[model samples]
Target: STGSATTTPIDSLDDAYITPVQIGTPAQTLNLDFDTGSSDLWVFSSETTASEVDGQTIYTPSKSTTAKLLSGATWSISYGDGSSSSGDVYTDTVSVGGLTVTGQAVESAKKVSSSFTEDSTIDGLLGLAFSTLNTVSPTQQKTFFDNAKASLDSPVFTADLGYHAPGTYNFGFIDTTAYTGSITYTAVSTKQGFWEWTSTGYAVGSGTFKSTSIDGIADTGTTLLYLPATVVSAYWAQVSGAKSSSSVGGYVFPCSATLPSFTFGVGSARIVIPGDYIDFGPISTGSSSCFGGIQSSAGIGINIFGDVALKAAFVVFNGATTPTLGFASK
Candidate 1:
């Protein structure tokens, strides 16, 4: 669908949204990153050592007359980047966009490294991108969208508008104003552990994927989706000798052709991918097969539904609300 971007204002607090974090019974508020790239609602806490806490935001339980620490059990996560911080574990009430939730798991960080330090425009992270990113284990966490699915006005569809950094996904709601016509939602295929769909055809440069039958997943957390190389290579074969560029990083193809379009079969619906997205930026190595969006994650292991594909549609995520999607205007 074609549309302009819409953003909820973010400011001071180095935050993303007006985050509602849960404590025993009441929810405290802060600004944070509602990241889809990963699932974990961690915030700075009062117990933080002055030196470790650094220049970050902390939820001073002392200030909250009703805050509760879950017995002060020390908890820590050594990030994939090899940095770590420790703090107490706790339960908190949290909310977003007028939705209230109780008993959510949150990291009460007392110690933090400089990289995770707080800024004014991003307060916390919310992983609306997908369920795989949720860091809070099932035994300890209860996200607002996870718990509210049964009662939401719509099933559960998250529309992530990339209008601003730390964009908020509307839980259990679809702004029809964002797209035209009734939404034809694809029923979910759950076994994959990632939200997926089947693609009917693929086009790269001017070439079309010969083995047109393909299955796919729509993952927002990942920046790019990995297509079977055979399919991508076939699509690339058609481009008019378009050289690669770097605006999009590795193996970026020239955005010159009116690439062929493909339809993804999502149970009852289909989502189309235009030629433009396929021609990604140029590559450093300059391989002629150098396609734009169709690079490779061979060793990375796993097919992703990255932002490139998602940015083209009005998506309804978490699928509780008969989430609908449709083509906007040409």
Candidate 2:
């Protein structure tokens, strides 16, 4: 049952990507964000108040003969960015890119925060994080990837995130042609149920690579790359006229400034983020001020290699025993 799903970025807000999936017996399709940072397959559903749902599509379990209620079970989740959703549970047939998971646990949203309600395009979230982090009550739920892994040709998934363009999330087997150059592999430590790893060090521009070890998580849900305060300050210091501004938020700098290249160590390999990519976007609308893409993860605890960083490389989230991440150029 090997499969692959092509993901497309949202037009206006290229912050995240969504993959189409089919749910229930008659097959209702929904565009879902494939989030590796979380572990619950939740969706906006008929249970959600119409006012809160806005233009989003809702999943109706009663319309599907194969859908069954998971009595008394409930799930709720709040993201790092403060977005949240909660609801009851259902066992339904969920399929993605032709791969099907029978009796997969599906969390139907009865409530959603303003952050989610406003995003009319995003119908739900498909968590790819380890099943250990699942939030279902009574019995933990397994991810769509986990449930379909046994029937897959291989136990791996590759994320080929793009920069202002569409990419793909390949499951079961890797599409070798999707990446370029040799893949540099590193062991991943998942005690926190995240694809967490330690970087050898990082450097700005062509500067000497630092030997510091930075612990971070590869999160597909987050939009920007977050680093430690010290690292964040060091990088910004190289940008003349760069400063932390309350109004513009994070580290803002002149859009015309000569931004330097950023690189992170992965074993003997160094994954680089181009200078242009580091310039998140202009601030204040049509202003010459722009915010740095790599911000400080001060209160966030662990560093995050979000879309900004992940898009710079082809990532492999290998789930087999001795899980590892294989990185390569796109």
Candidate 3:
């Protein structure tokens, strides 16, 4: 009815977070990205081409007595970063933390992009977004959360992402001690298949909060914070030696530059990201220039409140009849 698990960053840059998940009867444990931006519980498996396999763990359905192939079912997905994967489908016993779901759709990858193949830290993705976004054809499947929500004491899950530290993911109940202050609830629009919400405004460092409505999604899968060019530019302007570089493909600045904190509004509540978090890391090994954790979402179509922002607060994805997102400073 409830479950909890620890999630850790893949590297020092916090490029991504991964949580261990157990699949099948024999329990093949894989470190999977708990992604809120997509809705397909896909994994690297025995079906994947040998050449595409790197140093990541693979889930072999044949080893599980409970595993059953989803007849004629297949799935394919592409991410905003241009990485992609496609595969056939299987239903098997899957467990996270202590929560178990029988017949959970387990997409076995047949092919994967070079980026995924090279990233040995991640085994696959466990989608936490709405099931409506599931990409399986003819018979879209429910995500792990969707299938387990009905049995959970509370149909909700919380993400406590951390900066350079291990965080936690909790299902069925909220951990009151994990956050500070009261949670600010906002209406979520699942029409777009994302945990989309409108932020009331933003403030750079200790500056006055600007009154502007910005629509964005709380994407745990994405690595950086992306906002409108205007807001991103304003934040970078406050730091000396910071500039938008075409060669770098984003705003970069001297590694020693004093960065300012970024604050965004959730209703009347404000969540502030510390300055140190905005200073991502050096652009290259031993380089003095560092890439920013915040960037412009000019051409991305939708602004993304990624891990850079999520790590600053405790996020609740309430899966009640009327879905809502809750944010609290942690």
Candidate 4:
């Protein structure tokens, strides 16, 4: 779906407000995380914050206007990066796009690591990324959508980040001003949990996607794209003299090279990356601005199409839906 893309960049969270709902009560706001790497909607509460930790928002259990915590059950979260957090479990009404989702499964965090607290903009991640990857259990699988599904005229949730700044990203509806056409969406898969889609391929620079066997996952949580070094080297080989720049952990090419296009295969869906994305950067030494975005974190057995790939598109997520990471308008 060729959704929205702007030649100009906007500058604030107010401009990117989405229709995401809040947990807890009208008087008190609960803590939440919007994670793209994994699939789940988690929050914080009194049981979670029995210790009174600092730097993170602690949800006060007594204040929730509509839910209760499962005090007996405890939950722990550990990320691939070795970051972890532990807390108590709770049940509450989650407001999604202005619709109230009763009994929405939520994790009340007593302790979240500083790394996660500092790097990401969200206090707690509202993972519109996937459904089955859903942290909310099978018994409560459809809590969000089940309660509010009927209310959604558009039934979509959009993520509008404010220049990657903390406490500034907004979620909910898509803004037409951001792109060029009406948003198109693909049906979601309940199994993958994360909104897993295969890209048609990479358009290396401002060229055509030369049709290759490359698929991509659009993850907002990932800081950068991770590709196998061999995959990158082979692609960069097309550049007259592009080589790996260890300083940046990616393939660095001469600025003057005519970067080729990256073509990928995503199940049957194909989307191309514009040249500006492929080579958008500040290169000290280059004949021309060949794509400077491709880095070589290429460790075998790996590849990730991260935020850079998503920068050009308006991404929407649906936590209310089940078994799938709903791709809203874009």
Index of the highest-TM-score prediction? 3
Task: State in Å the error of residue 205, model 4.
Answer: 1.2
- Quote the positional error of residue 304 for candidate 3 in Å: 0.4
- Kindly indicate the candidate among 2 and 4 with the higher lDDT: 2
lDDT of 2 at 322: 80
lDDT (Cα, tens digit) per residue for candidate 4, span 82-200: 77666666677666434556666676676767665553234565554544454433233433433444655545445443233322232334456654545445444444445654444
Clashes of each: 49, 0, 0, 44
lDDT tens digits by residue: candidate 1, 90-174: 6666666656555555667767766566344443454443444444433444444556566677656554534224333566666
Task: Please state the error at residue 134 of candidate 2 in Å.
Answer: 1.2
The parts of candidate 3 lying over 4 Å away from their true place are none
Superposed model 4: Cα runs more than 4 Å off: 1-21, 30-33, 44-54, 117-121, 136-147, 160-178, 182-189, 228-231, 234-303, 316-330
Model 2 TM: 0.96
Question: How do the predictions measure up, each by TM-score?
Answer: 0.64, 0.96, 0.99, 0.65
How much lDDT does each candidate structure score? 0.50, 0.89, 0.96, 0.50
Candidate with top lDDT is 3
Better of 2 and 4 by TM-score: 2
